[PDB]
Amino acid sequence: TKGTSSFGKRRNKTHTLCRRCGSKAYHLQKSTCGKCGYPAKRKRKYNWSAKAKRRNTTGTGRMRHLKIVYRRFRHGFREGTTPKPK
Amino acid sequence: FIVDVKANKHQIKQAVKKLYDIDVAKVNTLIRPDGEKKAYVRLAPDYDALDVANKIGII
Amino acid sequence: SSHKTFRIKRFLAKKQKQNRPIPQWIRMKTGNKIRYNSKRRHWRRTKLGL
Amino acid sequence: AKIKARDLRGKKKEELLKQLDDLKVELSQLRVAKVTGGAASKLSKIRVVRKSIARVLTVINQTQKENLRKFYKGKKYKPLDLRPKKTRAMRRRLNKHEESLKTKKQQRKERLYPLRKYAVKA
RNA sequence: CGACUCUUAGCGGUGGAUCACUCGGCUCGUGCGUCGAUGAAGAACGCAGCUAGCUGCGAGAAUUAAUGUGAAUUGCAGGACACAUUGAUCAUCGACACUUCGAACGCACUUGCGGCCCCGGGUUCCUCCCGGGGCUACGCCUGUCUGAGCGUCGCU
RNA sequence: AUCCGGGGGAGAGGGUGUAAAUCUCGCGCCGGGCCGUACCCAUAUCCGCAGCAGGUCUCCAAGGUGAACAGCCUCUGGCA
RNA sequence: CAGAUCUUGGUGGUAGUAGCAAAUAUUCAAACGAGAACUUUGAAGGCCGAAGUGGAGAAGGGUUCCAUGUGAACAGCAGUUGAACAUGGGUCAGUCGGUCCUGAGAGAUGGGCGAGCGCCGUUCCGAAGGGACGGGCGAUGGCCUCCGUUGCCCUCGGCC
RNA sequence: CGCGACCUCAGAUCAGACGUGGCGACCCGCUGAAUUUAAGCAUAUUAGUCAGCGGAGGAGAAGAAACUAACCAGGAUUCCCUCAGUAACGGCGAGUGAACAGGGAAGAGCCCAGCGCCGAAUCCCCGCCCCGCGGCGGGGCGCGGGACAUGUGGCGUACG
Numbered sequence A: 001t002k003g004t005s006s007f008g009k010r011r012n013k014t015h016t017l018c019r020r021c022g023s024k025a026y027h028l029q030k031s032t033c034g035k036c037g038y039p040a041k042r043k044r045k046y047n048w049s050a051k052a053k054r055r056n057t058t059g060t061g062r063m064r065h066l067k068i069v070y071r072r073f074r075h076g077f078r079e080g081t082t083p084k085p086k
Numbered sequence B: 001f002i003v004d005v006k007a008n009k010h011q012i013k014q015a016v017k018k019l020y021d022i023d024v025a026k027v028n029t030l031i032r033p034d035g036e037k038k039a040y041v042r043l044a045p046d047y048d049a050l051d052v053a054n055k056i057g058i059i
Numbered sequence C: 001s002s003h004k005t006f007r008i009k010r011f012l013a014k015k016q017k018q019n020r021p022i023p024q025w026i027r028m029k030t031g032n033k034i035r036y037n038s039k040r041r042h043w044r045r046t047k048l049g050l
Numbered sequence D: 001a002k003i004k005a006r007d008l009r010g011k012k013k014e015e016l017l018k019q020l021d022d023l024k025v026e027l028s029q030l031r032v033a034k035v036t037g038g039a040a041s042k043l044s045k046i047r048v049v050r051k052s053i054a055r056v057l058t059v060i061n062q063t064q065k066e067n068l069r070k071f072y073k074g075k076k077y078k079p080l081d082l083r084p085k086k087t088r089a090m091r092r093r094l095n096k097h098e099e100s101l102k103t104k105k106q107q108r109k110e111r112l113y114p115l116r117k118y119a120v121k122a
Numbered sequence E: 001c002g003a004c005u006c007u008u009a010g011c012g013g014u015g016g017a018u019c020a021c022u023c024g025g026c027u028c029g030u031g032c033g034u035c036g037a038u039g040a041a042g043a044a045c046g047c048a049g050c051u052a053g054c055u056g057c058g059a060g061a062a063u064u065a066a067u068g069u070g071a072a073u074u075g076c077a078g079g080a081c082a083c084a085u086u087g088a089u090c091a092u093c094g095a096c097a098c099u100u101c102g103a104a105c106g107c108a109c110u111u112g113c114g115g116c117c118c119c120g121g122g123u124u125c126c127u128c129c130c131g132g133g134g135c136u137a138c139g140c141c142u143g144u145c146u147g148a149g150c151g152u153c154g155c156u
Numbered sequence F: 001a002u003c004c005g006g007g008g009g010a011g012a013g014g015g016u017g018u019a020a021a022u023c024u025c026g027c028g029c030c031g032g033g034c035c036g037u038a039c040c041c042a043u044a045u046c047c048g049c050a051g052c053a054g055g056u057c058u059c060c061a062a063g064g065u066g067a068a069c070a071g072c073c074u075c076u077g078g079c080a
Numbered sequence G: 001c002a003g004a005u006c007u008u009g010g011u012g013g014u015a016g017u018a019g020c021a022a023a024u025a026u027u028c029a030a031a032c033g034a035g036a037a038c039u040u041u042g043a044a045g046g047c048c049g050a051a052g053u054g055g056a057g058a059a060g061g062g063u064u065c066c067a068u069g070u071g072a073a074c075a076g077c078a079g080u081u082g083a084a085c086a087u088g089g090g091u092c093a094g095u096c097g098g099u100c101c102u103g104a105g106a107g108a109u110g111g112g113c114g115a116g117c118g119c120c121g122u123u124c125c126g127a128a129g130g131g132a133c134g135g136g137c138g139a140u141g142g143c144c145u146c147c148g149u150u151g152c153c154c155u156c157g158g159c160c
Numbered sequence H: 001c002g003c004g005a006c007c008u009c010a011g012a013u014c015a016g017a018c019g020u021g022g023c024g025a026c027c028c029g030c031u032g033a034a035u036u037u038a039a040g041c042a043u044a045u046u047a048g049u050c051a052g053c054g055g056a057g058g059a060g061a062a063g064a065a066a067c068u069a070a071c072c073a074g075g076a077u078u079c080c081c082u083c084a085g086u087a088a089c090g091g092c093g094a095g096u097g098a099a100c101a102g103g104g105a106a107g108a109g110c111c112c113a114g115c116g117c118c119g120a121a122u123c124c125c126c127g128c129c130c131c132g133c134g135g136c137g138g139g140g141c142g143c144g145g146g147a148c149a150u151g152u153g154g155c156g157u158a159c160g
């Protein structure tokens, strides 16, 4: 039918892991992500889902580089001068 | 042996040959479920797999 | 499947490494709160991607 | 045991590699001791060695770049490493003595009508 | 009335309200007001003696070096240190590293296929097979080199 | 994709003991990275909120009666 | 605060009640064991009866696979068993597949459109071939004999 | 039917550069609805608002009148109070709705092209050597390259 008798035919996967967002949104039959949009050059961000800008903007990650700009700035971007040796 | 993930069978031969000053006939490398590339190093007939075993520490 | 891609086999490797229970000695740390692992899953009650 | 970084700064770059490969064999040996039994004596020691290789490698990488950064000083085209990395903007925006220039017209006016102190009784 | 039921009280259970706490939030103000092709934001994978996440970090991976302090970390074993000395632990971090995906950059998205130059095996010039090293994106500016035209001319 | 046969004759080869060629004729040497590889495959390991009478693609296919892979009984194999 | 078929949390009567009835079927003895209608062995009686209640695969699951052990919890009774729980172990390729090829289709530069992220389009308004035999010269290399090799040019090549 | 200028126009893994993306609380440029109100409803209102697209900065934008005035006249921009919920718009319904003048915060001014004069007096880059140099600058040395007459640099711009 269309109830439980039709749920057995579900043995295909339209989506799969994306390569940029990391989520499961990479629509296979047409090659375009859902959560970020992969082949395009612009991260998909919309203002109608404010709880979707909170999940993956700046802060939620590890910040391998934006963390040490903040440490660097407090002193003024010092360069090449080791502290006075002993 | 257990070998880094990105390592050819051509590369494992050189490492063991240069490490223990030994000879290798052929190598077989599966990759375990955990993600470590297990490697089976068939030893050359000129050498005794026990006598090399004692050197590298394993009983 | 026994035709799994390399990437999938790698992803199904982390999901095995982190299925273990907590080490016993964790509970005795001075500031310690956890008392049994929570993320732990059983392959009949969770479907890996959902 | 313990190897300071205050005796490694001067040894030859062909002498360090001798000790660097010595440890990597010593670390290789200990890793066996973990798998095939061993005791708590050797297991804790792996952390002592694994940081020694950090000490020796860093000293090499430092004397390799300090020498190079002496080689490229006084030159005008130096590789992308040895140039400062400040930000995106503090390289394209600022300038040494290029955005401190005054035209002839601007120079002569400041030269001719200089600003000078005064004060007024009430 | 022994039972059953009802009402109240003592006690014991199911339950977590009230009360007091609080390394948490909301709101207001001040100072500063800084990301990225030298590779950002985000994502995957890894790393501890025992360790799953949480945090921290990147094959130098629960950190290296330097400075300041000055005798610990600790859940258990181990030993580092003559604490005597660069000298345990922590804070700062200016030096030194920084895997793979990502604007993502040889073509692709399957650890797939390549080219061009250097080094070591493979050679001993004898071409290959192996490993290591450096490049191989689009648009755009100035300059260089090579060029195309029954475009405009000059000359022999 | 790849592999092959045919036509045509630009070229090569030596001047009398030897060549150039074998759409390798018989031998001989060296090399063949990278990733998947267990198991279930279903009235229990999949989808239906589960050890759900539902659903989901194929290969193998004995003896007897019988037109027959029908129905029914038995052997290899399996089950409570 | 008594109410809003009020929100969240909790507990009753119903109630030890409905129920544990789809596909013929179990019995005797023995073993470990504290314990046995259910676990294991043996004997018997039955069924699935090769379009299977059999022997393997693809999708899909992702360690359920195998061994040792456990008696909290789950397996709508139980259980000495498990698909559970705790430790260990396991997946080896020139020749089996992937990779290579094109199929319906998808898609970028050229071009066109568009306020704009981009869009239409696939030979279509494009200087789209970076390769080769030989030849002339310069020029190394190694027995600069001879050939491997290199730069300029002459030639050759449909861009489909 | 060769040689040499210039003009248009390509290819370079040519030397040296730069953009791509992220954040978006504040800002700038486009695009731009419907619930709602009118006791219905279409103009109107909600409103040039939310949603969409682009682009930066620690601030953006604006800015030294092709101005306001009509006075005995003020004097770039922005911001506060006031003018004012007024003038004006509106199925003149619902509703919408500024500005000049005043006092304050701050106060900063200017540069070109053209007209023309100066022997392109102008400029980018290579190479050499001397100095500094972790915002690549200065000293000179070059019968070293190129741009530039289809116009660079100084004087000079409505206050002349």
Ligand SMILES: [Zn+2]
Pocket (backbone or CB within 6 Å): A018, A019, A020, A021, A022, A023, A025, A026, A033, A034, A035, A036, A037, A038
């Ligand atoms: Zn994505």
